[PDB]
Amino acid sequence: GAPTPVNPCCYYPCQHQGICVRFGLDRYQCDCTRTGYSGPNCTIPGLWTWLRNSLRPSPSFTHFLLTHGRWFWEFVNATFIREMLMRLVLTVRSNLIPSPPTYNSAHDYISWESFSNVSYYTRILPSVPKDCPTPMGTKGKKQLPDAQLLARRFLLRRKFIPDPQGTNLMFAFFAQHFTHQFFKTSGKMGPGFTKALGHGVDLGHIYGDNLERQYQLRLFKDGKLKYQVLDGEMYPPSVEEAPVLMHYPRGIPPQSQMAVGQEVFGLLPGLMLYATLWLREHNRVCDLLKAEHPTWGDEQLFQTTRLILIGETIKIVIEEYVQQLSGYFLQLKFDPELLFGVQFQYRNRIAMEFNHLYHWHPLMPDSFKVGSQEYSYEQFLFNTSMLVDYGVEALVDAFSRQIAGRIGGGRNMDHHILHVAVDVIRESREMRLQPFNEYRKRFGMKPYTSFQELVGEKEMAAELEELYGDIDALEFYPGLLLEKCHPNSIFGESMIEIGAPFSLKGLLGNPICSPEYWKPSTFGGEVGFNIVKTATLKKLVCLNTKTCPYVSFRVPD
Amino acid sequence: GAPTPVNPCCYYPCQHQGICVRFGLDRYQCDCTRTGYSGPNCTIPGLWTWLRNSLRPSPSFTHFLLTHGRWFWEFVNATFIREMLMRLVLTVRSNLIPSPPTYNSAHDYISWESFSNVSYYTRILPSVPKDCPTPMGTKGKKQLPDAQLLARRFLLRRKFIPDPQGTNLMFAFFAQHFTHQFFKTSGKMGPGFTKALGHGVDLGHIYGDNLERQYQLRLFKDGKLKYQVLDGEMYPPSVEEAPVLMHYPRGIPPQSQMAVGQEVFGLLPGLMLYATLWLREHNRVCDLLKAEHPTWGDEQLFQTTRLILIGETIKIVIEEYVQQLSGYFLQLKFDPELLFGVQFQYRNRIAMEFNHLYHWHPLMPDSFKVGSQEYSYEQFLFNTSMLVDYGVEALVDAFSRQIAGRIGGGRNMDHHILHVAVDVIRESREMRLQPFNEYRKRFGMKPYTSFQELVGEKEMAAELEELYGDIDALEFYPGLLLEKCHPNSIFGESMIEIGAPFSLKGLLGNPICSPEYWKPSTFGGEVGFNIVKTATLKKLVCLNTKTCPYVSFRVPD
Ligand SMILES: *[C@@H]1O[C@H](CO)[C@@H](O[C@@H]2O[C@H](CO)[C@@H](O)[C@H](O)[C@H]2NC(C)=O)[C@H](O)[C@H]1NC(C)=O
Ligand SMILES: *[C@@H]1O[C@H](CO)[C@@H](O[C@@H]2O[C@H](CO)[C@@H](O)[C@H](O)[C@H]2NC(C)=O)[C@H](O)[C@H]1NC(C)=O
Ligand SMILES: *[C@@H]1O[C@H](CO)[C@@H](O[C@@H]2O[C@H](CO)[C@@H](O)[C@H](O)[C@H]2NC(C)=O)[C@H](O)[C@H]1NC(C)=O
Ligand SMILES: *[C@@H]1O[C@H](CO)[C@@H](O[C@@H]2O[C@H](CO)[C@@H](O)[C@H](O)[C@H]2NC(C)=O)[C@H](O)[C@H]1NC(C)=O
């Protein structure tokens, strides 16, 4: 007879990535192995770490240096300091992600099932044990706030708040397209599994997440994908030409449906726009390789073109996508040679927290203005002809001229897609993610002392306090999307400091960035190795279109 | 109209791991990227490589230093020079294996299908193109020698030639058991595929190569495996208790069959001996963890014990298995911390050449002497009661007292298993492996100038020449098993210089050897982390048996 002692790991006693291990019935034991710190809680700093801890600048101070005084960055970008700084950004950001994946949605410990079964989403911090007092550990209330009252009172958009950095819809449809290749949650299996077993930039949203779908999408002649030429322009093939199951709506004839790598891409003109572009790019590279290598088979023309398009994707994401997102004056550079000196596992496992912080649905606008007229949400969604009605040139120019919404600060998510945020809050609770403050301590940040320190103003913090009860019990999604934005930035501090470790580890953590693959012979000679380099977003649109329209991630000024 | 020019890569023009790339119709282009050398054939040495190339000792000279003058090695083993040398052996041997796997049985080039589809055997050197003059490239005859006349005239044993190092059958049954966890060729798919997707030391031959087989083999109580206690001793469960398909012979009742991880282990008393031992070891560790962690579930008791047994396997293979095999006076040490300074991918992909050089069937003796009597091959094979008739103690002592056969030099493969060598020569030809000399140049060795330089004597070289026609056309299997043995060694030079890169890369290339996993919390506290360390072969037998018999890899002297 006893009051059933509390699980000591509910208090999160370990600090600095210390592993809480339960011993006996009520004791714990923090494993501070190579965590830099020692002691019963990994709070006593070692010699080397006490030096770096008292010399590390504030994370909000580093972002200030990278966004002011442009004259200093003009010189850095034109010397070898740029390469030397890039080696520092890639090394420091990647050290936070475990080199082999530690845990997953079923095991809160190192295990061979967590390492081998690639059908699982991995994770960085283990889940809250089911025998904790509160559903968030030891702090907060006995029942979390309402999932819909949270999304309506804080996340629902009232009026469109533009992005201060000028990010356009061409970036939004790129983000949705580029991420659906490793964010594919299986509805039949559950909320912690993925059909995208590639776990990174495999372009599974172009060639299919399996092999049968890949064969049915390929022409098997000159290594090309099946292409359907419509009134002069080249579009992806019709569904009856490439009979792979697409999630097209019922009733629309197969002459209108278009088969692509992903199953859902045919439900938006923007998602179908990029799938048309990469298919034009894929068939474009196949012509340039057959010229250099006539004595090549069908398979080698395809598998070598895949690595090239994987190469262009990693470059455009590093030097244009992340660049626009950060707003840094320091020009980012995708050079895998910068990591040849460091120990860096060229493997990646998609974490369930990365899927979480990537819900940038506030990007989407109130309506979609394609040139002359202005399509509504019900007119834009599931439109099976707008891509062919306008062509790639018109839609690319149209999306590059409309501003997207600010991410941080909250109250900027359009109400047609507010239900996605409610599924995120619900999934975050069924995965049992640790509080927002506990994830900051994992990513080198002090926890928020008050609620006003999080949101920035007094009114929103007052309601967020009575709902949760404690700042150490705030969930992961609200803290990210309700955090106060940096001045003239797209989102708050915690979005940059947590999102950057996952991105660079997922981009440079590709086998093509390894010394074994980063050769010109991998991409079929120097002709193909120079397609990976010098690859821009304009060279993706304007090299595959009849005319060259305006295409970038910012709106004209 | 033309004579259809020869494929220039049939001449293997590139040297020093240079990649032959075909350009146009008849030209080639060697990619010497980071190969150390430059020029049209990667034959012109760079500055750093010309220094190391004129200062690298002979591979037959390094083996002489490690096998003579024991007094010098007494001091090295008792100082930090042992650790410093071990860091050198692990780093230099592993640099030959590609960090991500380069090619496989279907692609002779870097490709995402070669990297992602783990159902393939990878490879180090690409295959001979189908448009080469000879089946071995450009040298040799138009038809390779007979597969059976080669195995009967050179590989077939005449009289038993013992192992000069004293390797016993306890080593042989360990080798066959330990390797069947990553050497499982799928008969239905073909000769280049594997059912052992773990690709390393996953102990899939204990817990099953899939998940359904794992569940059906587990007791799901205290994380143990289903165990069948027979007359006091603990044996693996009967097949009707763990209904997973075993390849037991037809007719024998299920009361006699025993279900284990692998399907074939029930066809030898030696294979069933180790499966009984590890099952006793697995259920032994489960008792030691439940004491330290009472508040643990069934899953964590199992998955943590798996990592411990994976840890003991890597240690016993490094410090006892490879140690006995090498005969070095330098004591080998399994310390993953020695690779924390080097860039080392803690991932492994099983190569088809590693499956090749591991055909040590000359280990098997003429007959099996179990204590008093002497069982023949037809009495030993498929014996469903000898393990229970004698117990683990008797069979372990019996196998540790009988010498095994020499591997190199040829003419030492027992005729009951000579058909395995014929399948190896046939598989080597259907995989189209490069000549034996071309694999030596890949593993830092000069090619054999003559046939006498290979075998050592005049008569065997004379017949091997008229069969093949050229020393640059000798296949991979005969060159390995017909090579002249080192003085008083188990096999020749090329077996040590090619086998060591694959082993250390496959042992240290495990995620548990990574800094992220090599913590005491991974193995459930310091109690379990010290089971991985100090784990010996005697502590595997004598800690799970009633009596402690003689158990080692050598025979008493
Ligand atoms: C280590 O961390 C814990 C958790 O934050 C600290 O809190 C103690 O938790 C134990 C639970 O077993 C309680 O019995 C103590 O009363 C708690 N202490 C306090 C001050 O609240 C613990 O103090 C930390 N240990 C050290 C040495 O700092
Ligand atoms: C799908 O998009 C097409 C155009 O891309 C829509 O058809 C146009 O609708 C506008 C109304 O704003 C008319 O002015 C045009 O004449 C139409 N053109 C064509 C070719 O149809 C269509 O209505 C959209 N479908 C849905 C369901 O909204
Ligand atoms: C590079 O390696 C090749 C292959 O060993 C050498 O052999 C030449 O191969 C080409 C095939 O295109 C023939 O036309 C030449 O006649 C071969 N040369 C000789 C001497 O046999 C080639 O010589 C090497 N190149 C260099 C510069 O050493
Ligand atoms: C399987 O092995 C058992 C013993 O492990 C064999 O049975 C023994 O055979 C010997 C003959 O050398 C007899 O002297 C023993 O009395 C037998 N003991 C038992 C318990 O049967 C058996 O013959 C073997 N089976 C085959 C097919 O060879």
Author numbering:
A (entry chain A), B (entry chain A): 28 to 584
What is the paper's account of this structure, in its own sentences?
Prostaglandin endoperoxide H synthases (PGHSs), also known as cyclooxygenases (COXs), catalyze the conversion of free arachidonic acid (AA), released from cell membrane upon mitogen or mechanical stimuli, into Prostaglandin H2 (PGH2), that represents the committed step in the biosynthesis of prostaglandins, prostacyclin, and thromboxane. The known COX isoforms (COX-1 and COX-2) are the product of two different genes. In contrast to COX-1, COX-2 expression is typically inducible in response to pro-inflammatory events and growth factors. COX-1 is a functional dimer, and dimerization is strictly required for structural integrity and activity.
The hCOX-1 crystal shows P 6522 symmetry, and its asymmetric unit contains a single protein molecule. Unable to confirm the presence of the heme in our crystal structure, we decided not to include such a prosthetic group in the final model. In the case of pairwise comparison between oCOX-1 structures and our hCOX-1, the average of the RMSD values is ~ 0.5 Å, and it is ~ 0.8 Å in the case of comparison with hCOX-2 crystal structures, despite the low sequence identity (60%). On the contrary, inter-molecular hydrogen bonds do not involve glycosylation sites in hCOX-1, differently from oCOX-1 and hCOX-2.
